[PDB]
Amino acid sequence: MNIFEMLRIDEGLRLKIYKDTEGYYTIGIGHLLTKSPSLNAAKSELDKAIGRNTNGVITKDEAEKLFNQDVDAAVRGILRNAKLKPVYDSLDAVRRAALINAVFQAGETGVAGFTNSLRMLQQKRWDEAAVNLAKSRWYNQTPNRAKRVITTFRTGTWDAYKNL
């Protein structure tokens, strides 16, 4: 298992525009196009990201290109966030993947309210971190996906994804 299969399981793959769990225009593998309620705004963002006139649909290859660009962006945002970097560096390979997954899910770096969780992670207080991560809108809105990531932080294994 690795970061790409991981998120690939968590995000799914759709080749035609769709609305995420939040009602946002997205496509491919978790690729948020826009937060605007405008389909037109979404197709434009889509054409621009793709480099061609899509008409709202892409090929598998195109989806995977976006995905690669996106995972790369995430890692790099982490490396560049002053609060994320140290956490990320203190972690093992498996837990690092969970951090990437979560940041990817946010579509942004060092999201609001997880200072305490980060601190517990950094100190390797796994069980406590798990519990704390769970007191979050995140967990309540997408409990299944959040449970998988949380289990990954607490254990340092891929157990939560081995069976999907």
Treating both helix axes as pointing N-terminal to C-terminal, what angle do 143-155 and 93-106 enclose, rounded to 10 degrees?
Answer: 150
Answer yes or no: 11 catalytic: yes
- Which residue bears the tokens 């207080």? 125
Residues 14 and 27: beta-carbon distance below 8 Å = yes
- Active-site pick, 5, 10, 20, 47: 20
Whether 132 has a binding-site annotation, put simply, is: yes
Question: Nearer to Cl ion by C-beta: 84 or 134?
Answer: 134
Q: Does 32 count as an annotated binding residue?
A: yes
Burial of 97 (0-12, 13-18, 19+ CB in 10 A): buried
Taking the complex as a whole, the smallest distance from the CB of residue 126 to Cl ion amounts, in Å, to 22
Give min distance, CB of 147 to Cl ion, in A.
8
Q: If binding is defined by CB under 5 A, does position 43 make contact with Cl ion? A: no
Site pattern 46..85 for Cl ion (x: CB under 5 A): ----------------------------------------
**Beta strands of 9-51 (E only): which ranges?**
14-19, 25-28, 31-34
Contact indicator for 75, 58 with CB cutoff of 8 Å: no
Interaction residues for Cl ion, span 103-142 (CB under 5 A):
142
Select 57 or 164, whichever has its Cβ closest to Cl ion.
164
- Asked if 144 touches Cl ion (CB under 5 A), the answer is yes
Q: Any binding-site annotation on 136?
A: no
CA distance 41 to 81: 29
Q: Which positions are catalytic?
A: 11, 20
Give me the residues that bind Cl ion (CB under 5 A), please: 142, 144-145
